Amino acid sequence: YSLLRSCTIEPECIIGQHSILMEGSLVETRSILEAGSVLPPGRRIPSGELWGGNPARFIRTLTNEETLEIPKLAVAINHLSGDYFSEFLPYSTIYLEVEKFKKSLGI
């Protein structure tokens, strides 16, 4: 439930759920956006700062150990998506069901 629209997100910018990013927002590199954050149009997030609350509100600073975990999270989600990708092969066989249904009535 990330409501992105005409935004600009830099690398390592993990975004929480129910994020309502407006147009023109610039989430600068290495930033964290807590769940439910809604930032007004034109507002920017300074690097290394995590924000939360209904409006764009500074919460606390970031340390190197916390910062470096964002790429690890991204590659973990990538690994999960790679596991999910192998589930379905190209060119699904659903067309057999359609052809059988067509053969069952007329042609």
Partner 1 sequence: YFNLSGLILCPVLGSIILLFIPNSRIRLIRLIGLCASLITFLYSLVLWIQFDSSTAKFQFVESLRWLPYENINFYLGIDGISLFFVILTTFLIPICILVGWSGMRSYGKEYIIAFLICEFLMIAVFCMLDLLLFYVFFESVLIPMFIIIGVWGSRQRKIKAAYQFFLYTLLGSLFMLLAILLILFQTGTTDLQILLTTEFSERRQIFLWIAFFASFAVKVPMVPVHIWLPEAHVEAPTAGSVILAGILLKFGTYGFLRFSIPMFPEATLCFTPFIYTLSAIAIIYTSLTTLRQIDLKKIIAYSSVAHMNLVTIGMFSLNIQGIGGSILLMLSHGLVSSALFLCVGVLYDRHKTRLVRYYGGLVSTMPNFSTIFFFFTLANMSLPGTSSFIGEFLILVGAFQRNSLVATLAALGMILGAAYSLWLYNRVVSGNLKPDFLHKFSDLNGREVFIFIPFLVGLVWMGVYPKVFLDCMHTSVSNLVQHGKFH
Enumerate binding residues for partner 1 (CB under 8 A): 72, 79, 82-83
In the bound complex, what is the minimum distance in angstroms from residue 82's beta carbon to partner 1?
Answer: 5
Kindly report the backbone phi and psi dihedral angles of residue 57, in degrees, each rounded to the nearest multiple of 5, phi listed first.
-125, 125
In the complex with partner 1, the residue whose CB is nearer, 59 or 68, is 68
Residues flagged as binding site: 5, 17, 84
Neighbours of 62 (CB within 10 A): 15
In the bound complex, what is the minimum distance in angstroms from residue 83's beta carbon to partner 1?
Answer: 6
Residue 1 to residue 4: CA distance in whole angstroms: 9
In the bound complex, what is the minimum distance in angstroms from residue 30's beta carbon to partner 1?
Answer: 17
In the complex with partner 1, the residue whose CB is nearer, 83 or 97, is 83
Residue 31 to residue 48: CA distance in whole angstroms: 5
